[PDB]
Amino acid sequence: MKLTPGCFLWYLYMDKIYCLLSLRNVKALMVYFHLLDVHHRNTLNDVLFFHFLQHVTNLNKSQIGMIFDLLDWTAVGEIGFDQFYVLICILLAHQDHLEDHFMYRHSRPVFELLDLDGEMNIGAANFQNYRFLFNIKKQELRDLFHDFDITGDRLLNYKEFKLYTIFCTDKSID
Amino acid sequence: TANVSVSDVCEDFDEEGKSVRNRIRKYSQTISIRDSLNLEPEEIQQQARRELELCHGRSLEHGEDHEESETSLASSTSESLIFSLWKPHRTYWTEQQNRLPLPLMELMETEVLDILKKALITYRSTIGRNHFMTKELQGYIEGIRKRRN
Amino acid sequence: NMFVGVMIMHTEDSMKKFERDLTLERNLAIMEEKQIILKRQQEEVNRLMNTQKSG
Known part of the structure; x- marks a missing residue:
């Protein structure tokens, strides 16, 4: 198999979600993970x-500790190879200008990455962690939170998050 | 010592359809001419970039892939990455042409295997979470992996 | 007790309408901003369609 069928399907989805599918990016990530994983466990x-x-x-x-805490949802004190690959694909050379639009596209659910609590609601701590991971102004983040908080309860729904992401993508495309 | 087959690294890897061997021969001839004329390294790099752009700068009516390659070569970072990828592949093909395989490759493989075994033994058993020798070995292994990558 | 009750509910009913008017003004600003965004999006879509047609 080409490094398991699930990773092949994930790479196909990434190619269908990105303009450029690169060359052996998943293989390079796997090699880097194997170099990092000394015990190969x-x-x-x-x-x-x-x-x-x-x-x-x-x-x-x-910031590295916060990213490790957010990615390791199992809370076992270790980061899996799949979690490392997901984090590397989430970064995807974030210094590039197109990387901001790629992160705006995010992933297939594109709701649970920011929502660390998992209760279909993103708090102020989740927004602060997102602003730490992706560089954004505090005033701009506050304005975005105020615009997303239609009810004023400081909670973002999955449908509301999808609508905000669609509006941001449409504004960036034009 | 890339230790790769000549028929694999010179199998027309370019998507534009241009032959890798002809481009490698042209680059070698240009390098020989520059060395005869005593050209500077920056001038040699600029000439190689111009030759690589002209390789993808074929007739634009014969496919939009050449136009896309010429547009990509007009940038700074993408063109530099493409030139770096082409130069290592061309160097590997040139080395594999005459005779690439030789000794000390098995020595490097044995060193890599021993390093991996030692790293696995260090990471598997850790009696002290605040020890200094195991943490230093882990940091050295991480630095070696970062330098190799 | 009549004094404290009279002033308590007079103040309550005075502030209720003021807060409701302030929230109404904020809501009106919100819908005006949304209408501005919608008009800008419609203008951008129309300009893109016109450039696609003329291109």
Whole structure:
């Protein structure tokens, strides 16, 4: 198999969601994960992930720890290879201008990435974590939160999040 | 020592349909002419970039792929990445032409296998979460992996 | 007790209408901004269609 059928389907979905499918990007991510995973136990420690982030993205230690906490939903103290691949695809050279629109497209559900609580509601902490991961002004984030809070309860629904994402994508396309 | 087959790295990998061997021969001839004329490295790089752009700068009526390649080569980062990818592949093909396989490749493979085994033994067993030797070994392994990648 | 009750509910009914009017003004601004956004989107779509037709 071409590195399992599920990863092939994920790569096909990424190609159907991106203009450029690159060359052996998933293979490069798997090689980097294998280099990071010393024990080859399909998992990596927080120190190895922090070192990889500092060597590749040169991120801060607190931001790397927050990203590791958000990605590792199992809370077992380790980051899986699939989680590392998902995080690497989420980054996707975020310094590029088109990477902002790619993150606006996000993923197939594009709701649970920001929603760390998982109760179909994004709080202020989730928005702060998103602003830490993706660079955005605090005033702009507050204006976006005010625009998304139609009811005023400081809660974002899945349908409301999809509508906001569609509006942002339509505005960026034109 | 790329240790790759000549029929694999010179199998017309370019999507434009141009032959890799002819482009490699043209690059070698240009490099020989520049070395005879004692050209600077920056001038040699500019000449190689111009030759690679002219390779994709064929008749635009014969397919829009050439036009797309010429547009991509007009940028800075994308053109530099494409030139870096073409130069390593051309160098690997040139090395594999005469005779690439030789010793010390098995030594490198044995070193990589020993490093992987030592890293697995270090990461599998960790009696001390606040120890200094195991953490230093893990940091050295991470740095070596970052440098290799 | 008549004094405290009279002033309590007079103040309550005075502030209720003021807060309702303030929220009505905020809502009117919100719908005006949404209408501006909709008009801008319609103008952009019409301009894109015109450029596609003339191109």
